[PDB]
């Protein structure tokens, strides 16, 4: 009672939250995590995980791996963060095309890793915001209002329809607003 | 009984099950009854007035034909023809009579690895003895010879030229280069030729432990004219002391060509042996079966279990114990021939899935096998007629086919030709056309309408609309709607609809029944198709299952221990599972695990049983209910209790079947005060 | 079902042995070995690098050392997807000595570029590199010839450091086993482990498992074969069905299994859990009537081909159709298993007459066509083929009517109206969607879809007809993209409907043909093999139940678990629910009752006018179709089956509501739910055991003590594990004199336990008279310590002993008429009765007592 956060085991777990703000970590294994009400921070960890945020504004933290995950944020403005794919240590997932991540919220997938002949995906539904990696990335929006951040590298961002908020970050970035009333920030570096 | 669904003809009725019959007598169906009332079971129809001489009831029957001009027949009959009705098994007997004096052609293969030196010394002084032993069984006999070492390629044989010159470990004496297979002596009845040809053989050697004798056997079986086989009993003695290479071993030598099973002999040598892989055991078995060659594996002690497994793949083969010096060989052939001849197998060639064939065996020893996939029993004796019962069951109305039943190891065959019986011998040439209003003919007791006319008596025309008066017979009662809402009323009978949902076959007089509304076991109606079928509220199963959902097997239940008693007399068998009473545990209600120790009281019987104490309390008869004594010790509850007089008496109390029934063993030595 | 066969590109090369070994490399090229081709004098074996972009290929230059004579380069190959690496081996190096000749092996490791390559009785006839794999630490080379052909494997952690892994020689049973003929690597928690196959072990075969325990490799499990000469273990494959990073099962092939009609066999082996034994669960088979087809000679992982997120495999049968060959495809299924039947069979005779041994080598798991779909390379004698996966499509269809129901004036009988001038409308919309993920652009995929519309299908005469065709059937074909398209068409009725109780039914079924993609080599998408191909909608008639009103029914549902208080899981296997439904309002059409129950309940039967019922889960029962009349009532029982290993908590809930075609607002009468307690059946016994002391005697003139132990045995014979408590009542004093001093309880299984002791007072003060009746010294006439021990986990089908030991004295003895007194101690098991229950007639064994007789 009166506990807000939980860290799972190295095995398969089923973690459910409450109406308060929770930080739920699954670690190793295949885990099913439900955030329920409030604003929650969900980190499945390694393994094939199924993550729900339900109502509220939720955040999903992804890790450096090739194993696919299913993400459904439900109602509210939701984001997914891919910053941990590239880190100063040694990277297990391949990026042999040199494209970091590729996101298409209209087609509901994120190409989290890519070898020359093998492509690894994540299934993403009802998520409106994406945060990229330190390398170059491709970010694509949908018919809703999206907040897209490229971080470092030479990124390309397309907002699609609606009123979007696109961030370029450090490096030379390509930002396209498309239809709607958009807000464009370029950041450091030579951008168009 | 007759589960019929929708039936409208005699052939349609008989095709719906093996028990359905067709009463043909006229003036049988009332005006308010349909034509489907004819397709009932025999006793029910005979009860309601039908006679035994006016039911059709096509029945499967078998008739045999024998060759009178053919003498000394060993397997009879020769030709049989069947009139098969689906769901009903036709049965006939096939008789096997063992003949006398059939000549023997024995071919000898011996390994020439270095450990076979003494065997080679003994075998090359043995032709006359083996020929004499052959003649003691039949008037004429011939013998042959062969050899094998291994393929001449690494890692099987050292390919160094010096080692190919002399592969034997010792350089002192004569030793021939390695080879795969050499055919030495033709099948002859001369002993001196056997002595001279074999006497020229020298020993060989190789590197691996397993030897490639399967190549030699396939070459022996694949070159009939070179070997000298005649249409008599053919034997093949295989004398080794180690294992054998088979398919897949050749990849170590970069050989991946599968064995073609064809003759590759040039100058009595298996050249081209280094470009083909070893045969598989299946190929060897198939070739030997098609050429009627019977292997005799003369192997050493440590290899008997290995070669015994081959007999499950290769019927008509025997395994013998070969000594290290090969002095007990002739006796081994005698015993192997006795064992081979004493057993008889009956089998058929490949036949489609529409036909099922089952064999039952009766023979001299009294052992009888029922419902076996092939016929087999040992103890077959000379001039003793041994009979097999062949049951043939058809699952559908088959077309004309033929399959051959053969006795394995012999050329004699029994040819069987099958016919369907899906036809009714109805009377129609002299039927009264007036009853059909002139618009049809009376076939099997029912009328068939011409073009345009419809109705059971052809009283309506299809182009005209159905009269409202006839619609009264299309509803069950005053509250039931016409054809139960799932059919149409035309000319006084209901015509049911179809449905897009699979399995929705609407049938019945008023279209009331349905196929998917029955008791459900594990989410499947009637336990799925493999246990039973649904007939609008009642589930009737395939044979071997029973119950409201066919979940219970009828017989061969697991409730019986090996002594053939239900639940050891400690419960009741209910749907293949024992329902134990009191505190006895599954599956056979044997043990009483939490059970209070019985040894406290049963000393009262033990005192009198083996110490000659008389009646105290009463005589030890009409008391001691179900307690008996065992001379030898019996494994069970070891016990020690105080004697009624003061000493220490220890007994082991084994439990037998029944209620409060045991078996006791009381020790005779007592520790006393 | 989605492997291309009409547009397969074939590589042809005249080198001997071409197609014997095949491996994909870096998503654009495929490497093929030619083991028996003579490159030059004293050289045998060659490698080829074949590209899909150009369609031809040239040998890979490689400087063979002079000592590697006749090495047979290319007999075994391996590769790593990321980072790109290639391993090629020749296991037939003919090292020639003064008196002997030996067969050793060499292997060459390649990086990203194919230009520089490092060279990698007892270990003499090693044949190193016969089968090889690439670990993250380094190359893994097997030696089938080590130690009299017992086998082994070499694991290289560096260029000059290696470790030897093999069995333990307890006897000569492993001689001539050829361990390392096949090899594989299993993954779990990002640590690798090895699987090695020995197809000649005792002529039947053997497959091994190896784990690194505290830095040393040891064998932890193995399986064995059955039929002699079947080569059990000649091919191995590790499969991860869910693609989560942990290997689930190992496929083992027996290509030379013999049956009268089939040749070849593949066994599915799930990985052992902890220290449990390794077992086979399923067996895959080839087609009938193909003896010596060598099913299972080569098998590889294809990845997800049909787009269901489950891994799929391909198995080769080179010996089929008189050595022409075939390739089988099996889909993966939920539960870490392989489907027992194949989904596709590609035959060499259906590709080209020149093909022989088609399927002797396989390699898959990558894309070489650059369209984002996995591809399969099949090697044959002199040819190498590239089969390509195809896009998978599904179609969803929807039908709406306008108006939703036929109006009353449309079908009413009238004489002053024009016959056949009735009206209507139906809207039909089709949508084509794609399942697989790939790199082709949007709008390239187009398909031609034709379909049937059938009004009143299953009826001799339809009540309604289309306006344009004037009959019940209509055919139309059109081209679809990946976008919904809609079409509308009028419905006309020629005559009045005299049976308005049956709605008009519309049926739709289609066939789809995919147009080729010119930019990606004429690839054609295909329909899913399990796609729904028939759709139906209903067109009901208007009701006129009374004075032309809307048909106002009133429906109520109630049920009760009659005369049942608790649901005992593990006892009775079924229970009833008597439910009654009332219709107070006017006529109800298409009455429907839907139930909702947890996952451990299954619908068995319904017993009671008519009642047809079909299947948290749910079941739907029909209430006297078509009409459930006015002032009607039905009562019936619905039977359920309760699983013996059910998990429903302590409280299970059932939910049921009623529905009808009139579609009226929900009411409290429509919904009902009731709650029932749950208990779990438990069976466990406690018994005295023989070693417990039976007899003691003493002399009053002597003051010597003695030791007494009462040993009880406790077993959980039931199918459940529960916390339990053991209580021992111990007689301690009698008339203020110690009997059994400081008794102690100890457990034999050293399981977790805590005990606490308490004293209770006798009920009968006059101990002398009580002894005069019966010579029992128990808690009735003595002071008893109550030792209670609590066990938090009493496991399933496990047992332990509980001894109760202490020393004695005989100063409490009463000189009664009988020459003996009995000391009785009772041990009885408690549990939470609000959750667990004993079966009737089984509660007599949860209690026990032990007696020790004392005489002077
Ligand atoms: C597995 O490999 C070990 C060596 O790692 C083998 O052990 C040798 O066995 C031979 C044969 O008896 C002995 O002469 C050596 O002394 C052993 N060496 C050591 C270090 O133990 C073992 O025989 C192999 N097992 C099998 C089944 O081949
Ligand atoms: C041996 O075979 C020859 C060849 O026909 C025959 O003439 C001779 O009678 C045979 N001898 C015996 C004893 O059968
Ligand atoms: C033996 O049987 C075969 C069967 O094909 C036949 O061709 C041959 O003529 C028979 N007789 C001899 C002497 O081979
Ligand atoms: C290598 O193969 C060639 C092929 O003809 C053969 O001549 C040569 O003897 C072989 N080398 C050895 C050492 O066996
Ligand atoms: C719809 O099914 C019928 C048979 O039920 C078939 O003849 C027809 O071809 C199918 N429709 C299409 C478009 O294939
Ligand atoms: C219905 O009409 C169409 C168009 O006239 C025709 O193609 C089709 O064959 C007709 N169907 C029947 C059953 O007559
Ligand atoms: C209870 O269910 C059983 C099914 O096993 C059924 O036979 C019986 O009639 C039912 N009893 C009542 C009162 O519903
Ligand atoms: C019946 O209850 C279920 C509960 O899931 C609900 O989905 C459904 O809409 C309800 N139907 C009616 C007619 O109340
Ligand atoms: C006590 O029992 C032992 C065991 O036999 C016996 O030898 C001894 O005489 C007994 N003592 C008395 C006083 O009865
Ligand atoms: C119990 O009594 C026996 C025999 O009198 C003695 O050997 C032992 O040490 C005693 N133990 C205790 C704990 O008093
Ligand atoms: C104790 O012993 C007396 C005397 O035999 C007996 O009647 C009683 O049932 C025993 N148990 C208890 C709990 O009193
Ligand atoms: C209890 O003790 C007996 C002594 O005969 C022993 O055989 C048995 O294994 C013990 N119980 C357990 C669970 O070890
Ligand atoms: Ca708190
Ligand atoms: Ca976890
Ligand atoms: Ca929350
Ligand atoms: Ca996880
Ligand atoms: Ca994850
Ligand atoms: Ca939330
Ligand atoms: Ca949310
Ligand atoms: Ca959202
Ligand atoms: Ca970036
Ligand atoms: Ca947008
Ligand atoms: Ca940037
Ligand atoms: Ca926009
Ligand atoms: Ca804009
Ligand atoms: Ca920038
Ligand atoms: Ca800038
Ligand atoms: Ca010998
Ligand atoms: Ca897994
Ligand atoms: Ca799949
Ligand atoms: Ca492709």
From Swiss-Prot, chain C:
- Which consequence is recorded for altering residue 61 to H? Influences susceptibility to SLE
Please state the protein's primary subcellular location: membrane
User: Where are the annotated FG-GAP repeats, by residue?
Assistant: 2-59, 60-119, 121-165, 166-217, 218-278, 281-339, 344-404
Q: Where in the cell is it found?
A: Cell membrane; Membrane raft
Q: Which cysteines are disulphide-bonded?
A: 50-57, 89-107, 429-486, 545-551, 613-621, 755-779, 784-789
The tissues in which it is expressed are:
Predominantly expressed in monocytes and granulocytes. Expressed in neutrophils (at protein level).
Where Ca(2+) 3 is bound, by residue?
Answer: 367, 371, 375
Q: Tell me the residue numbers annotated for binding Ca(2+) 2.
A: 304, 306, 308, 312
Does the keyword section mention Iron? no
Q: Where would I find glycosylation on this chain?
A: 70, 166, 244, 467, 471, 509, 576, 637, 657, 668, 697, 703, 735, 750, 778, 801, 807, 832
Which UniProt keyword terms apply here?
Calcium, Cell adhesion, Cell membrane, Disulfide bond, Glycoprotein, Immunity, Innate immunity, Integrin, Magnesium, Membrane, Metal-binding, Receptor, Repeat, Signal, Systemic lupus erythematosus, Transmembrane, Transmembrane helix
Example of a GO cellular component annotation carried by this entry: external side of plasma membrane
How does the protein associate with the membrane? Single-pass type I membrane protein
One GO BP on record is:
response to Gram-positive bacterium
Residues annotated for Ca(2+) 1 binding in this entry: 240, 242, 244, 248
Q: Does the keyword Repeat apply?
A: yes
Q: Which residues lie on this side of the membrane: Extracellular?
A: 1-856
Question: What role does it play?
Answer: Integrin ITGAM/ITGB2 is implicated in various adhesive interactions of monocytes, macrophages and granulocytes as well as in mediating the uptake of complement-coated particles and pathogens. It is identical with CR-3, the receptor for the iC3b fragment of the third complement component. It probably recognizes the R-G-D peptide in C3b. Integrin ITGAM/ITGB2 is also a receptor for fibrinogen, factor X and ICAM1. It recognizes P1 and P2 peptides of fibrinogen gamma chain. Regulates neutrophil migration.
Subunit details: Heterodimer of an alpha and a beta subunit. ITGAM associates with ITGB2. Found in a complex with CD177 and ITGB2/CD18. Interacts with JAM3. Interacts with THBD. Interacts with complement factor H/CFH; this interaction mediates adhesion of neutrophils to pathogens leading to pathogen clearance. Interacts with TMEM268; this interaction inhibits ITGAM degradation via the endosome-lysosome pathway.
Q: Which disease annotation does the entry carry?
A: Systemic lupus erythematosus 6: A chronic, relapsing, inflammatory, and often febrile multisystemic disorder of connective tissue, characterized principally by involvement of the skin, joints, kidneys and serosal membranes. It is of unknown etiology, but is thought to represent a failure of the regulatory mechanisms of the autoimmune system. The disease is marked by a wide range of system dysfunctions, an elevated erythrocyte sedimentation rate, and the formation of LE cells in the blood or bone marrow.
Instruction: Give the similarity note.
Output: Belongs to the integrin alpha chain family.
Record remark on domains = The integrin I-domain (insert) is a VWFA domain. Integrins with I-domains do not undergo protease cleavage.
Q: What is this protein called?
A: Integrin alpha-M
Organism the protein comes from: Homo sapiens
Q: Gene name?
A: ITGAM
